[PDB]
């Protein structure tokens, strides 16, 4: 047999894999968290987008901190042997390293740990992708004119830079998700995932700017952040 190259994840398993979409819109009153208008638009876009990539999409809405954890645990214990990859999309309130259940927060690290190389072996060596639309703090960008590591093969696609707010439009959905779906829709059959994510960075960075009656929140910008510990190139085809 002719010479072979090994630069890309094997994405030709019988299944592309799960796409779990956690859509938190409505929060228990006691948390003091606002209702996240527009997030349903994000959830629908993602569902359709990842449907077309041939992912087995599971939408979950309005989950408690307990339900998020139990869900992630249960999913990490499924047999992923026939699956190429895993995708988990989190839409909620957040702070740095944290996303909100409807009744309180969960550590991102606690969610991702379920899928570590040593804790879910049917996903070992396969790409584990986490896409997070949530704040990472309260800063505003004013813009300017024989063994593998257990943390290997994780990619975290953050909506925003570390420490910063992330922006969501109540009508159109969040800047990040809408841009992400557009680029997946447009480039998933021709670009490796990092270059797709890089077009998402540019789209968000250049095409969006906030409008507010409050000068503190007006004319602000956003740059998403790619957190990659992938060891191969990922192509959805």
């Amino acid at each position: 047999s002719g010479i072979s190259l090994d630069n890309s994840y094997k994405m030709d398993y019988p299944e592309m894999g799960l796409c779990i979409i956690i859509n938190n819109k409505n929060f228990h009153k006691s948390t003091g968290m606002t209702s996240r208008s527009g997030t349903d638009v994000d959830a629908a876009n993602l569902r359709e987008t990842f449907r077309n990539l041939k992912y087995e999409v599971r939408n979950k809405n309005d989950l408690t901190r307990e339900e998020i954890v139990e869900l992630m645990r249960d999913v990490s214990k499924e047999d992923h042997s026939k699956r190429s990859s895993f995708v988990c999309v989190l839409l909620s309130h957040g702070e740095e390293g944290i996303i909100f259940g409807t009744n309180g927060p969960v550590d991102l690290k606690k969610i991702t740990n379920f899928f570590r190389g040593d804790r879910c072996r049917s996903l070992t060596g396969k790409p584990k992708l986490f896409i997070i639309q949530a704040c990472r703090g309260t800063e505003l960008d004013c813009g300017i004119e024989h063994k593998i590591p257990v943390e290997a093969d994780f990619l975290y696609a953050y909506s925003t830079a570390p420490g910063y707010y992330s922006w969501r439009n109540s009508k159109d959905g969040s800047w990040f998700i809408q841009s992400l779906c557009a680029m997946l829709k447009q480039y998933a059959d021709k670009l490796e995932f990092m270059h797709i994510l890089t077009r998402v960075n540019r789209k968000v960075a250049t095409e969006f700017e906030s409008f507010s009656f409050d000068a503190t929140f007006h004319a602000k910008k956003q740059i998403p952040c790619i957190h990659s510990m992938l060891t191969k190139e990922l192509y959805f085809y």
């Binding site: 996240r36 707010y165 992330s166 922006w167 109540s170």
Partner: peptide, 4 residues
């Protein structure tokens, strides 16, 4: 426009 709102923040998360």
């Amino acid at each position: 426009d709102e923040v998360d």
